[PDB]
Amino acid sequence: DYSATVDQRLPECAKLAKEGRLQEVIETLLSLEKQTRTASDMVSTSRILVAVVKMCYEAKEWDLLNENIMLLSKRRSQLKQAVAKMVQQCCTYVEEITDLPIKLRLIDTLRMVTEGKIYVEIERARLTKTLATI
Amino acid sequence: ELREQLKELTKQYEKSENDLKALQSVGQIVGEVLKQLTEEKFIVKATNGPRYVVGCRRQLDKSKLKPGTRVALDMTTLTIMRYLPREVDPLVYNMSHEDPGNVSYSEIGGLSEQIRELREVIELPLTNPELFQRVGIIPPKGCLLYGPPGTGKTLLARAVASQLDCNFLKVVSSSIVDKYIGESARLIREMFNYARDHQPCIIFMDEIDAIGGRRFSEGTSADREIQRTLMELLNQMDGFDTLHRVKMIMATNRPDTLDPALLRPGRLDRKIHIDLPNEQARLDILKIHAGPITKHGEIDYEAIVKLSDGFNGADLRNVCTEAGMFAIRADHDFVVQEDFMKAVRKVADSKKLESKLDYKPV
Amino acid sequence: SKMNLSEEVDLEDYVARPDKISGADINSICQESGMLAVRENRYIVLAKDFEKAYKTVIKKDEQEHEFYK
Numbered sequence: 001d002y003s004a005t006v007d008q009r010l011p012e013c014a015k016l017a018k019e020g021r022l023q024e025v026i027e028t029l030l031s032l033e034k035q036t037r038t039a040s041d042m043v044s045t046s047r048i049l050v051a052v053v054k055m056c057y058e059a060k061e062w063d064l065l066n067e068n069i070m071l072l073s074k075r076r077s078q079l080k081q082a083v084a085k086m087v088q089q090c091c092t093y094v095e096e097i098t099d100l101p102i103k104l105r106l107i108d109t110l111r112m113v114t115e116g117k118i119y120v121e122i123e124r125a126r127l128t129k130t131l132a133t134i
Numbered sequence: 135e136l137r138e139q140l141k142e143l144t145k146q147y148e149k150s151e152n153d154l155k156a157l158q159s160v161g162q163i164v165g166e167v168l169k170q171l172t173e174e175k176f177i178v179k180a181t182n183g184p185r186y187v188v189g190c191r192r193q194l195d196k197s198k199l200k201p202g203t204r205v206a207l208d209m210t211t212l213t214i215m216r217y218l219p220r221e222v223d224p225l226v227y228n229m230s231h232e233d234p235g236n237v238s239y240s241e242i243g244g245l246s247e248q249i250r251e252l253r254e255v256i257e258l259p260l261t262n263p264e265l266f267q268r269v270g271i272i273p274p275k276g277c278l279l280y281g282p283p284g285t286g287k288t289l290l291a292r293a294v295a296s297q298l299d300c301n302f303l304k305v306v307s308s309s310i311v312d313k314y315i316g317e318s319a320r321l322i323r324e325m326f327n328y329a330r331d332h333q334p335c336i337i338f339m340d341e342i343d344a345i346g347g348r349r350f351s352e353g354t355s356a357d358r359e360i361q362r363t364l365m366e367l368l369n370q371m372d373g374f375d376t377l378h379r380v381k382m383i384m385a386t387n388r389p390d391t392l393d394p395a396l397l398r399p400g401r402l403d404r405k406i407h408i409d410l411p412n413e414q415a416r417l418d419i420l421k422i423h424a425g426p427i428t429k430h431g432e433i434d435y436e437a438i439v440k441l442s443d444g445f446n447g448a449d450l451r452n453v454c455t456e457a458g459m460f461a462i463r464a465d466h467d468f469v470v471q472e473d474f475m476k477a478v479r480k481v482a483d484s485k486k487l488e489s490k491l492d493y494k495p496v
Numbered sequence: 497s498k499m500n501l502s503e504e505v506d507l508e509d510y511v512a513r514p515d516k517i518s519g520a521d522i523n524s525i526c527q528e529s530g531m532l533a534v535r536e537n538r539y540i541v542l543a544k545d546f547e548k549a550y551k552t553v554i555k556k557d558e559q560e561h562e563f564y565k
């Protein structure tokens with residue numbers, strides 16, 4: 001049930017964000033993420049989180065992306081592995097980013113998100129290496 | 135026929151020759167070496183208590199027998215014959231080998247938080263001991279499953295014993311007590327020696343208040359002996375020699391009578407309360423214990439739970455058993471909600487004979 | 497000092513409480529905070545962890561009737 005509903009919602013909401021970026025898709029996906037988080041479905045939550053960061057990235061969102069990453073990370077009882085996929089997606093995103101100010105801003109946001117979490121330790125280490133290289 | 139006849143006779147010949155060879159052998163007195171004197175003189179004390187200086191038969195690799203090692207002295211000349219591994223008492227052996235049935239965690243109801251605290255203390259530190267090293271702590275060592283009678287402490291202990299792999303030592307604290315001088319303290323010492331020898335180990339003491347009762351300032355000689363046993367136990371847990379990979383679980387329903395030194399955070403680190411089932415816990419226990427009963431109606435488990443206020447898990451099991459009793463008494467090969475209601479009211483009436491149950495540590 | 501705390505702990509709030517607790521109790525509090533951090537899969541202990549550990553360990557609060565004072 002959850003797999004079907006998430007795979008049905010993700011393309012429709014992605015399209016709705018694409019032709020307008022109305023951003024109501026963000027709240028719809030947040031409600032679906034809450035449902036899957038309660039149900040403990042892992043792959044679902046992972047897909048919703050990665051798609052949320054996806055669309056926030058294709059949209060030229062230099063602040064909404066950071067805010068949404070923070071809220072998603074600090075939600076009530078999210079799945080550690082789902083947040084792990086989200087952070088991995090954010091790392092492969094920040095890799096291909098110019099514009100030093102927003103580069104550093106997103107790097108710092110990810111560092112703050114993953115300060116002291118074992119499941120994201122390797123990603124934070126690579127992120128710190130990237131920050132030091134910059 | 136002579137072939138098979140002589141074959142069987144030759145087999146019995148081998149057996150009888152082995153028996154005679156055994157018959158031509160005498161026993162040897164087991165002692166422990168205390169020190170080596172002159173490469174041929176060893177101060178060894180026989181377990182019976184006397185101490186001697188004895189010789190050593192040649193092929194013993196004197197380095198193998200160091201102060202404290204068990205040896206087999208000859209029964210006549212008392213000369214060492216062979217070094218032996220550390221003794222395991224028959225008591226400690228059966229302690230380790232008791233069968234905890236095959237209880238699974240699916241047979242325990244309202245205890246979910248308590249189950250995961252017990253598992254936190256027991257399993258994870260012994261399977262991934264480096265996470266706690268990274269965080270910078272030494273994982274907790276002792277658990278006190280304390281609660282009203284029949285709330286599931288011993289059932290939880292049985293489930294842990296059945297579902298975990300590391301060595302496990304079953305013991306009722308009242309089955310350690312012996313009338314001999316120092317025997318109980320010696321038995322506790324042997325418990326912890328076995329645990330240290332088999333490094334990943336758990337020691338479950340059921341109804342600890344048999345031994346770990348408060349220390350009397352005006353007690354009798356028996357009380358003083360049992361207090362010696364208790365203090366040996368306390369030293370073993372958190373004395374001079376640190377305990378590594380040996381965990382303690384202790385079950386009780388009168389925690390208020392336990393020694394403060396025993397209840398100290400250093401010895402019994404985590405005291406978890408197996409409280410009487412709440413509404414959902416009662417529902418879960420009733421489902422668990424009525425699953426195998428052939429019910430042939432619509433069962434308002436909610437109504438049974440509502441009338442089961444103040445019950446324990448054993449009380450709910452008895453509710454199921456009494457519903458069955460009503461079934462047999464009515465000559466029915468099944469149970470119904472009228473039977474369950476009668477059973478729960480009967481158990482509620484039986485509960486009137488109890489007394490204070492809300493006993494807490496400290 | 498042996499643990500790795502987050503800079504938001506501020507152990508002073510826990511120290512300045514009216515509880516008669518031993519060094520073993522303090523070690524138990526810190527140990528339970530670390531245990532909670534491990535439970536949540538973090539290698540840094542937070543003020544949340546210390547609050548929960550203290551409330552779990554120092555549970556001596558009972559009685560002290562208010563009309564005696």
Ligand SMILES: Nc1ncnc2c1ncn2[C@@H]1O[C@H](COP(=O)(O)OP(=O)(O)OP(=O)(O)O)[C@@H](O)[C@H]1O
Pocket residue numbers: 241242243244245281282283284285286287288289290385386387408419422446447448451
């Ligand atoms: N939470 C529970 N879930 C299921 N069954 C339970 C539970 N608690 C008790 N029981 C039932 O109680 C009986 C065993 O109780 P147990 O020996 O665990 O009690 P205890 O809490 O150790 O009490 P005591 O203080 O009397 O030794 C079995 O019938 C077991 O099914």
Ligand SMILES: [Mg+2]
Pocket residue numbers: 287288289340385
């Ligand atoms: Mg019991």
